[PDB]
């Protein structure tokens, strides 16, 4: 069943490509770190007033 | 009111001292391109410096 397994793998790679090429927000775990670090720096800057 | 101290020249584009009506500090005085509204004097930022 090598040809069937090849076509299923290609279809799965294409569906991963589609769900990333759409506007589905999937990198939230990576965006959280940037948001928390930026917010901590903004609070540390606003403590000077 | 403007207490009695003699004024000097305005030097730009290099790290100098300044004193604008009591506003002491140290920095580079580059000319700007953003017009105020004609009743405003200061300007501030997130840390509330000029």
Name residue B27's beta-bridge partners: B16
- Neighbouring residues of B14: CB distance < 8 A, sequence distance ≥ 6: B28
Helices (H) and strands (E) in chain A, counts: 2, 0
- Angstrom CA distances, B30 to B6, B13, B21, stand at 23, 5, 19
Report d(CA A41, CA B5) in Å as an integer: 41
Cβ contact B47–A42 (<8 Å) = no
The answer to whether A49 touches B44, Cβ cutoff 8 Å, is: no
Tell me whether B45 touches chain A (CB under 8 Å): no
Tell me the DSSP string of B1-50. Answer: ---S--------SSEEEEEETTEEEEEE------PPPTT------TT---
Q: Are B43 and B23 in contact (CB under 8 A)?
A: no
């Amino acid at each position: 069943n090598q040809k069937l397994i090849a076509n299923q793998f290609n279809s799965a790679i294409g569906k991963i490509q589609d769900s990333l090429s759409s506007t589905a927000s999937a990198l939230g775990k990576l965006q959280d770190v940037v948001n928390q670090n930026a917010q901590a720096l903004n609070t540390l800057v606003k403590q000077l007033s | 009111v403007c207490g009695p101290k003699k004024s000097t020249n305005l030097v730009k584009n290099k790290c100098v001292n300044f004193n604008f009506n009591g506003l002491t500090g140290t920095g580079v005085l580059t000319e700007s391109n953003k017009k105020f509204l004609p009743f405003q004097q200061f300007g501030r930022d997130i840390a509330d410096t000029t």
